[PDB]
């Protein structure tokens, strides 16, 4: 994983998400959603995912919320007042725990100011506490600013590492991205039928077609401008729309 | 280098109140993590309040609510105003510059009693 | 849960010896804390850092030993000047558990 002051940044773009095989894995500790409720999620679409990914100890997952307070949600990691994804974490003792104190992970204690949201800061200057510049020397009246847990296997639960990936959903204001996967029945050929075609809504007889839609369109419309064809997605193949039987 | 010095204490009856002064003889209390330790005599210390270098409060247990801590950094003093003492914290008040881990903590006394 | 640290006080010995004082720790915690030298009637000040690193402004005569948990303090070599109580912290976390306290006699 990555350290929790610098922590890393994904930026998922168009695909088929299914925030299903998340929600239901069991496997993690804490799963919370904020803008939107888990369940919906497969069923809605944004323009970005983000994704960031950090190691964090076991009792400071309650701190990766809007609107806390702490050495972690101070100045390390800052999630807006108005936050829209989900926050999912689980533990990893046995992953990034080793005997003898792992110390390769870091995070930030001192800072002059709180920060923005979404802000990072991977700097590295001497702390300078004391009004004597202390001209990039320790001692006193100066500290270094990044401290290591020195996480081991015989820790307290609370003192376990935790590792933590916070998505955040965004729309800006393109045309489209990433949605969830769509569901999909069968061709009932013969049967009149109420059907939805990635938007056309209508009713009828679907029927096997023999007309060659060139390599791009999607239906086929007749004079006086009623739709009479349609393409199929899961399989791409020309079908015929035949109104129902009245007299 | 470092020689905090505080005051403030006297005595009081209960739903009182007082302002307790850590003045930061030594120097940048703007940008330091500072904290009230108390202890009733004859027993150990306990841990009361901290300021954060950029502002947060986090109580104690029992002293959840009803007790506030601020700092003011042009006058390089802490603040630590409370109020409706339960009588029941009547101890030896300690201000420390916690540097991570604790060091440089001057002393002062208070006392609560219902008369 | 809180820790709930211990410590097996009342010490009593003569100068120039070996006197060792160990702290319990009732849960798992990792491996910082800190000791204090509380004089009666003053301030305290700290003598071993988050683990057995004594802090500076110290004579050599402490040898904090750290673990996992169950921690331990030890004396070599006693001078009459230590009258006073010894306590155990656990920084890292804000509201922090104390100890007990060890006061240490001397024999004469």
């Known amino acids: 994983f990555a350290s929790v002051y610098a922590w890393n940044r994904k930026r998922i773009s168009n695909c088929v998400a299914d925030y299903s095989v998340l929600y239901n894995s069991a496997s993690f500790s804490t799963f919370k959603c904020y803008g939107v409720s888990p369940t919906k999620l497969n069923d809605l679409c944004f323009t970005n995912v983000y994704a960031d990914s950090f190691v964090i100890r076991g009792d400071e997952v309650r701190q990766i919320a809007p609107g806390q307070t702490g050495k972690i949600a101070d100045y390390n990691y800052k999630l807006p007042d108005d936050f829209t994804g989900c926050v999912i974490a689980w533990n990893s003792n046995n992953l990034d725990s080793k005997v003898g104190g792992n110390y390769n992970y870091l995070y930030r204690l001192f800072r002059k100011s709180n920060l923005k949201p979404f802000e990072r800061d991977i700097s590295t200057e001497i702390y300078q506490a004391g009004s004597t510049p202390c001209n990039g020397v320790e001692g006193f009246n100066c500290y270094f600013p990044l401290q290591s847990y020195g996480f081991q296997p015989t820790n307290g639960v609370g003192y376990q590492p935790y590792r933590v990936v916070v998505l955040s959903f965004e729309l800006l204001h393109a045309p489209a991205t990433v949605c969830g996967p769509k569901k999909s029945t069968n061709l009932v050929k013969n049967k009149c039928v109420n059907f939805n075609f990635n938007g056309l809504t209508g009713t009828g007889v679907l029927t096997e077609s023999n007309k060659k839609f060139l390599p791009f369109q999607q239906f086929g419309r007749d004079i006086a401008d009623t739709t009479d064809a349609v393409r199929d997605p899961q399989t791409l193949e020309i079908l015929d729309i035949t109104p129902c039987s009245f007299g | 280098e470092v020689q905090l010095v505080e005051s403030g204490g006297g005595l009081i009856q209960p739903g009182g109140s007082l302002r307790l002064s850590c003045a930061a003889s030594?120097?940048?209390?703007?940008?330091?993590?500072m904290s009230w330790v108390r202890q009733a005599p004859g027993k150990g210390l306990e841990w009361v309040s901290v300021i954060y270098p950029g502002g947060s409060t986090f109580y104690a247990d029992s002293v959840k609510g009803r007790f506030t801590i601020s700092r003011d950094n042009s006058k390089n003093t802490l603040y630590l105003q409370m109020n409706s003492l339960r009588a029941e914290d009547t101890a030896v008040y300690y201000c420390?510059?916690?540097?991570?881990?604790?060091?440089?903590w001057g002393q002062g006394t208070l006392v609560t009693v219902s008369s | 849960d809180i820790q709930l640290t211990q410590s097996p006080s009342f010490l009593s010995a003569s100068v120039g010896d070996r006197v060792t004082i160990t702290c319990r720790a009732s849960?798992?915690?990792?491996?910082?804390l800190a000791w204090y030298q509380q004089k009666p009637g003053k301030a305290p000040k700290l003598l071993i850092y988050?683990?057995?690193t004594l802090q500076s402004g110290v004579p050599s005569r402490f040898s904090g030993s750290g673990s996992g948990t169950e921690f331990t303090l030890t004396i070599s070599s006693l001078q009459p000047e230590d009258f006073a109580t010894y306590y155990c912290q656990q920084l890292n976390s804000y509201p922090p558990a104390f100890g007990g306290g060890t006061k240490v006699e001397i024999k004469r």
């Open positions: 420390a510059r916690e540097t991570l881990a604790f060091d440089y």
């Open positions: 849960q798992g915690i990792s491996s910082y």
């Open positions: 030594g120097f940048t209390v703007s940008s330091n993590y």
């Open positions: 988050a683990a057995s």
